[PDB]
Amino acid sequence: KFASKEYGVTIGESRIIYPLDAAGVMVSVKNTQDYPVLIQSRIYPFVVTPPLFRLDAKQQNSLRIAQAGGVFPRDKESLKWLCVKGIPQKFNPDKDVGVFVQFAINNCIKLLVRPNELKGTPIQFAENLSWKVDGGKLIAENPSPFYMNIGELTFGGKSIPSHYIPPKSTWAFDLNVSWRIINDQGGLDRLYSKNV
């Protein structure tokens, strides 16, 4: 038998905002191990540069995200994912014998694509969510041009696993509603309540 569990939390939101129609954006990638790693980037259209490079211990390097430049919707935000993979004399039985480890790490930040033509900010629209219940699931609708990053969500005084609400669209949660979205200062915006 060999078993492992991981314990920890995500703090806040992290995102890259790509302003639609910009030649591109630059993003830092820092290796914080104290050994060399091979960094490989992909997006999930857009294209990332270099698609593959070496990073020495404690060093950082920039990446350039840039858009193929095909049709994007102009009425709303879109969501892509940037994923960055990192890959890595006398005999002495106290040094040499035992268990040795290696690990590969795959990271993904949201890459948020925000058309220049779009009005205001998520905050200004957070109240305007409305809610309903269907085939057992708690459905939320977002009329907003923005993704609504749900950070606190209670239904009938009991809290529901969060998830963003795509703009001009809907999202369906598993089981009176209150919610807070996440503001552009990593923080939680104010609370709202509604009915069904």
Next chain:
Amino acid sequence: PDIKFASKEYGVTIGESRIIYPLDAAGVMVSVKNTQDYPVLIQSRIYDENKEKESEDPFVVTPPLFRLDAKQQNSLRIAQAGGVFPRDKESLKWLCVKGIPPKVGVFVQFAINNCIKLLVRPNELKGTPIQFAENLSWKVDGGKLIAENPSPFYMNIGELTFGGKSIPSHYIPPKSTWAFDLPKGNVSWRIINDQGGLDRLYSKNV
């Protein structure tokens, strides 16, 4: 002693998230989220790179101890319990949230200590870091590269080279300086903006 396995976000960091605390606001709230599908016990605290760990911070989080169920999230409440802080410049604090087990073979337990920057921003402060990145000046002393920051903001640097050679980035504290180590014998830099992206390149000679 605590056996350290990896560093941030498992050794690979994209950009840098930050939290702004508007000085003498009653308090900010922060989302915290358990990605596992099993319960996690959560311990939160504020630290300062200039204060001893055991000692208390003027700033405080709530709940300082909280069991969080599978996939669940909770809000933390950061509050300045009346410390005294400068009006003219930013102050850096760190909110850390550590997970732990709730109460033939190996059973391994990985405990993630996740810290994010708490940037204490006086409201008597107009503009943003973006508008001050230029103002950095550079100097070499006892073989260390020294950055002077005349501005009220922290310059969270994300790209640094000195004579083509890339240097392990750090921040430069406001109205203060920072000393970088060298390898061999012109300076170029980018700070990290709010879009979580990198700012423009600037260059200057020592």
Next chain:
Amino acid sequence: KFASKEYGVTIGESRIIYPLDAAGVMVSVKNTQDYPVLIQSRIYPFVVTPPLFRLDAKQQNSLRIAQAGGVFPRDKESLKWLCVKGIPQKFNPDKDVGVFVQFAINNCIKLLVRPNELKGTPIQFAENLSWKVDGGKLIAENPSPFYMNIGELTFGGKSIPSHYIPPKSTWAFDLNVSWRIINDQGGLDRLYSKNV
């Protein structure tokens, strides 16, 4: 997602021989980590001493295995298992931030109970295994008073996951036979062949 695999082999056999009817035996337990651990022992009758104790980094301590002294068979060897569990100022964001680990470890050596009255050694009896096939499984019989520690086992030129063969008893394997047992020098004894 979080996943881990372990890669390694068992070398040879390890056992404690308890000579039936002895006041007891002594066994070393060494902690090879460089930190303190809490050692807890159990047997799977017999009794182990201390049943629970602290062991500093690199230190060792003895354990006394001793038999309740109830009825044991005298015609053959018996098999018990000894299992030993081991349980365990300025802030600086390069030292303090990241992933930290702990692990508990549970070890089991065979505890082989060998009556004084018993003749010879496994080696002298290794040839005397005989084989058959039934409900799809490859069955081995052991007429020997000893456990036969199978270390190499091929059937129709293809190798089968090993397992000991209890004495005056039988064992059934999943799917001409050849086999080697393990001698009391950790090594592999000679090869034999039979039919069905």
Next chain:
Amino acid sequence: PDIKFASKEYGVTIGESRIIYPLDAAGVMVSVKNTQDYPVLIQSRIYDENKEKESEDPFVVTPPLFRLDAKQQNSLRIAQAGGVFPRDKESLKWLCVKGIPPKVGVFVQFAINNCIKLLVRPNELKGTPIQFAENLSWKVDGGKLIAENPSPFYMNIGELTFGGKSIPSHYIPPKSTWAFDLPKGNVSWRIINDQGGLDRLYSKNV
């Protein structure tokens, strides 16, 4: 560099297995076993605490590289490819067998480097370690506890105390000595016998 996670058998060692190689036997065979239910790649070699790792040993294992399937076992073949070794005393070698992968989240790989003692025993040597445990003598020098071993065998010590204080055990090489570190300022010991058990206690004054 290789990132070390734990030491032997994950930090908790019961007794000590050994392998005896009868000097100038053609070769001994050893069982090796994959407990996982997935394939493992196996790399075997002999080392000497007195030779450099990269350098070749007179002794050799076969196959030096072997993929072993789920739950499978294989025999290794240790052979003295005509080195020159003393007839009068034992020599210690080490057979090491390392496992490796065959060719959102973390994927972790634990690689176990398992070594067992290869005790090269001349046949011109009657008796066993058991019959010589008594012959150890002790001495204190520059604040180290020194064991003299006049015997042809390795005294694989499994219990040592000096003035009630327990000392991290080691072996004492035959017709040679060993130097133990101290903590504070009478000696008691047990070697490890063939039943994998501990021998009788002996005591002596420096």
